[PDB]
Amino acid sequence: SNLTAQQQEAQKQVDQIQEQVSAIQAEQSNLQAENDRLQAESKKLEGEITELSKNIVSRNQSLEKQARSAQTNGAVTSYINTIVNSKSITEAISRVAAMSEIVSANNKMLEQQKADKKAISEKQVANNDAINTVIANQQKLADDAQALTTKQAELKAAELSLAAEKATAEGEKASLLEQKAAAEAEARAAAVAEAAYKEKRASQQQSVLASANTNLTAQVQAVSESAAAPVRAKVRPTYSTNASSYPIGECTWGVKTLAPWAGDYWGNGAQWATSAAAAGFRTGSTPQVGAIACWNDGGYGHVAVVTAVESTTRIQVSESNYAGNRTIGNHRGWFNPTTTSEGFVTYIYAD
Amino acid sequence: TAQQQEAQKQVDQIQEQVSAIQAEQSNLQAENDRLQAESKKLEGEITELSKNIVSRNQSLEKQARSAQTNGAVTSYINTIVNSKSITEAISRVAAMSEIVSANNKMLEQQKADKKAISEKQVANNDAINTVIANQQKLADDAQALTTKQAELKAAELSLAAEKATAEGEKASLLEQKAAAEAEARAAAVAEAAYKEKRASQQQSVLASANTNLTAQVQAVSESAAAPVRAKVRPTYSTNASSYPIGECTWGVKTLAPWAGDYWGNGAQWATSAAAAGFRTGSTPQVGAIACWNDGGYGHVAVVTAVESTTRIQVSESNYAGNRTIGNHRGWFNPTTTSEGFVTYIYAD
Amino acid sequence: SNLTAQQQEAQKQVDQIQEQVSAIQAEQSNLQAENDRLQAESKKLEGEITELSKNIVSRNQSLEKQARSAQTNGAVTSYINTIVNSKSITEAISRVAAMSEIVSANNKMLEQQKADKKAISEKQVANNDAINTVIANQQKLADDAQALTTKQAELKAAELSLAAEKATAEGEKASLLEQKAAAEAEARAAAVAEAAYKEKRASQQQSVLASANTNLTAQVQAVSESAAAPVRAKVRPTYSTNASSYPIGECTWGVKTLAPWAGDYWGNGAQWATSAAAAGFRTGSTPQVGAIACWNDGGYGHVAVVTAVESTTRIQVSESNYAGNRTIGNHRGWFNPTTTSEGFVTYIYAD
Amino acid sequence: TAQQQEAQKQVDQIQEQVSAIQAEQSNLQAENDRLQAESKKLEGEITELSKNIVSRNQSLEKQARSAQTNGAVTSYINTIVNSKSITEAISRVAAMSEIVSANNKMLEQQKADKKAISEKQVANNDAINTVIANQQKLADDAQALTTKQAELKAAELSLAAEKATAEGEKASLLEQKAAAEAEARAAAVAEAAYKEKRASQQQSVLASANTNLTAQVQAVSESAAAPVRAKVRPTYSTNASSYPIGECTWGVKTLAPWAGDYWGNGAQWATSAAAAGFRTGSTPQVGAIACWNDGGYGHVAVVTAVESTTRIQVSESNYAGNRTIGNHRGWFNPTTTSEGFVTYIYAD
Ligand SMILES: [Cl-]
Ligand SMILES: [Cl-]
Ligand SMILES: [Cl-]
Ligand SMILES: [Cl-]
Ligand SMILES: [Cl-]
Ligand SMILES: [Cl-]
Ligand SMILES: [Cl-]
Ligand SMILES: [Cl-]
Ligand SMILES: [Cl-]
Ligand SMILES: [Cl-]
Ligand SMILES: [Cl-]
Ligand SMILES: [Cl-]
Ligand SMILES: [Cl-]
Ligand SMILES: [Cl-]
Ligand SMILES: [Cl-]
Ligand SMILES: [Cl-]
Ligand SMILES: [Mg+2]
Ligand SMILES: [Mg+2]
């Protein structure tokens, strides 16, 4: 080699910084590649979780209908007597043998339900861990991009410093020493930027963690305390506390009795949601316990108060004047409120 | 004579009652027909006013709010000072009077519609009530008419006996009178049974009013079944360590600790919640987890206020770059956002 | 017996008519009982048909996703190479053994799908036959009620005729012979009513069968030929046939190119449904081929033209300016239009 | 001198071009800001007018139609002749003028709103178009500015050489000029590549316009998949012998022979159709089978005309006791009937 001692020192600074630069770039490619495959694992797990979810919900309903039919009490006693309905001279019995198959099919169903609940649970943790890793990697990538900008600026200046030590000229040493001073100033700018980045990142996270010091009630309190605070309910009218405005036994009289917050002159049940909306009440398509269910059939319609909710297509209700019975109470048990002869259902909420 | 007048008096008294019932039947039936028509017309007008009132309310809240949004009003005061620059014929301040005139005209029409619907509601309600009372009166009259017409029959035969002839015939229609009087007693016993039934049925109805919602809801859970799908629920962690700091999932888990621990990207929370046994739906409720699915990562938040399906407030984390938990948007429409299809997960 | 010859003749008429009366009443109870149990069989079959239907639809989607993943072509070649990725010194392989289980699970799925399609088919015919029998019985019950009214009126008169032949009195024979003449007149009235019933029933059915002499086109023609005929589309404006009102490459320009019946000044894609509705176009939530899909995100939104539809949550579309690509064409393949970053989807229909 | 003026001229010419670009950048950016604001305001007003126009159209069709329903107008002519009976101060004919005045006022406001939305649409559309054109011009200017500023640099160094001193220095900044001119050439080649790319991209976009819907739909079916779910469909009977005469099912089967043969009560038709591979949905289309489910027997019909989701006509059998096939209701709302939840089954 024709290398000097001073030139080797400059070469060492270039090789050290280049090593750091390549190390950052290698990790960037490493993390970006890991994220790509983890995002793919997640997508696949997500599709499988969706598949299991609908099956679990569907199978639960089937298992609850099959339980109800197998545990109705009043009709089940006859199903136990059907097995006993065979002893002496009845030709050929295949009722008891067929009873084993429906129980075998039943036991097979809950075992598959148990397996699906196990599988979705396992797929959830793996998916969640994959998603968490990807976010941590993305944060590491953001940190590396700032570090790379700094180290590449340092490398530039170091390479110019090496170019000065090699220079076989008085004219040129001076030229690239001006360029080195310029490059070193740029490297300082990059470092100060990275310092501000770390400074900002740290305080931002502390500000995020500080906001966790709260709860829902305080959060809901802040809405009503603000200017944009629910004041649409202020313009409502004070209604009567009794049902004297509705005739005895009617569905309207019944709902007014159970839900005294309803209006006094809201007419036929069919029009209650229409009048309630005008009065400032919130309406919607999903049942809530305590909400007034309003069915519109283009005629008189019907109203009731929701007493229990399992889904949008499965509720219980307390009502008056259903199928000729004018007493207030539970007339139907569980039923689907979207598929009745009273028509389009809409719910009126208290708040 | 004299005895014949007494018989004639009984016929005329009962005939008077019979005609009175028939007159009232025609009276009530005619009143019901026109009241049912008045109701139908009022119903159509109430529907017309209702949609206008709701629509106009939304319009009135989109207006005024945009011209009185805290932060934005200072610019509206500067607009008059900026339009005052002499270049060169100014009609910006004069045109500002027209939008305020149009605004004031809108709330005055809203106030008139709320007044009109209120008046139409009471008239309609009274009309409906009157019709039902009349129908009950008509049912009572039909039973009374059957009785009085049977009494009239016997009374007319009694008069026919006093006019005599005499045969041969007195004895004949006195047997018919005794038969008619027995029929009249049968009609009376039938009307008594009718009143007996009507009275006890109404008492049974009035007895059922002695209740309230809580007792009603209690009877459902006390019955064989009875919501028992929530019994199989799981114990989730009480902290948000399973979700990364600043993410929307971490924020919702912080505000709604009843949510799951490994429910992944916000988009899939409703899907996992439904599998876990939670109830989901399309209408916002305060305290519900709003889950938006965009076919990607999606988003989650907790509903803090609800005015309608298309107007809510929420508290969330990581919205538009801001990773702190809080209110980021104010009032907004959750169905029309870049995070996609909204679904709500309810606590119970 | 102290029975006369004439009295026996009267007694015979009573016994013959009573036999007919009891025969009708016996059949009424017979048919009413059969209908009750057939209505119950139907209800049970209906619930089972609903159960099978949702499973068949759900399982079809799963089988088509599992087929797609197992028949993607470009990624499947790697799945065939994974089995070949084992020969000499690889420790323990359970990738080929696990491949048998997913195929076993796949083959088990289509066999259960085939069994469910077989079961629903069988349950459909049994249910349909049960429903048909119940309607035929109801028609027979309507016929019997008319016949019963007639025969009971005949019985009344016959019993009075017997009461006249027994009568041991000059005073009473004459009385119940007047009652018999009255009863016979009532019996004639009942017969004439039953004749009118049969007369009406026969001609009504012929009038119903006559109305079947038609088809949809004639039916749709009669609507437009009537006074209540679609004339809301008359007030529309004639739009330009080119997309010069929209800038090159935009989504609006693309939709206008493929659907020239769209408007010229409808602005950002998000507002197209809003302007279309004002212009008199019909809008809705379900995709149709040739409909303009309008997504509203509270911003600029997006528009496209629907090119294929499998369900509400699965369509294909041709569009312009998707994910940076400004050419008109198919960018996404099959996708769910309700779950995208462009927001709330609404469809604008040509008619 | 003289040579220095030539150098000064080159600096002043290029500086003029540089300032012209920068002036236009500020000009276009300012115009876009105010046009984006005009658009936002117009958008809100278009939304306001749209809902009013749709709402008012429904109101106008519920009105007039009720006062001009064939069969019902003869009674409206008799109402003036019946209110003319002298009993005793008549204000029924005078009040009839007010509802017609209110009606005529409604269509005049509808006509004004259709005029206003049309005008607002063109102004908004032109505003949006201008903004996009400006954004493209801004992208072009940024590339041109980079080039002209590089040319200016070299020209200023050329002027600095002619002023000289002279050293020692002429030679120094002539080397810098040669370096600057090389940089200016690099900027020009970059702008050329930009124009090269921009031009070919637009040609590729314009090329894709050479198509139509049919070719587009053809490419879907020609691709790997391609709707092939309809391939597995079944051959049903061509007559309605499987359904009893006069029933709603028999009627729909007669009009829509593509329906199934053993689909039972009308209520379950959508359920069986979905299992059979047919597409279902919540929006009416002409020729679709409407299936109403009331938790009981339900009802079916064939859609013959559609105005909206809440306004259709249908042809059906066995409606309100009438078992003939035909139009029984005219225009009606299929979501608000006593037959329950409506769902439509589509042919394809
Ligand atoms: Cl909390
Ligand atoms: Cl009812
Ligand atoms: Cl009762
Ligand atoms: Cl009860
Ligand atoms: Cl934490
Ligand atoms: Cl974490
Ligand atoms: Cl963490
Ligand atoms: Cl959406
Ligand atoms: Cl046809
Ligand atoms: Cl896009
Ligand atoms: Cl492009
Ligand atoms: Cl493409
Ligand atoms: Cl036939
Ligand atoms: Cl048949
Ligand atoms: Cl037949
Ligand atoms: Cl409904
Ligand atoms: Mg905040
Ligand atoms: Mg007809």
XYZ file of C-alpha atoms in Angstrom, chain B residues 38 41 48 51-52 54-56 58-59 62 92 106, chain D residues 38 41 48 51-52 54-56 58-59 62 92 106:
26
model
C -110.934 13.531 9.953
C -106.580 13.507 7.010
C -96.074 15.849 6.487
C -90.657 15.006 8.242
C -90.432 18.769 7.651
C -86.961 16.743 11.470
C -85.473 17.858 8.133
C -85.610 21.548 9.073
C -80.993 19.207 10.711
C -80.828 22.171 8.316
C -75.970 22.613 9.878
C -71.292 41.788 0.906
C -86.695 29.283 8.904
C -66.712 27.982 -2.944
C -70.291 25.892 0.287
C -79.883 21.056 1.150
C -83.349 16.577 0.121
C -85.965 19.338 -0.178
C -87.008 14.740 -3.094
C -89.147 15.402 0.001
C -91.307 17.978 -1.793
C -93.218 12.935 -2.425
C -95.437 15.574 -0.793
C -99.308 12.440 -1.988
C -115.866 25.675 2.566
C -95.408 24.390 -3.552
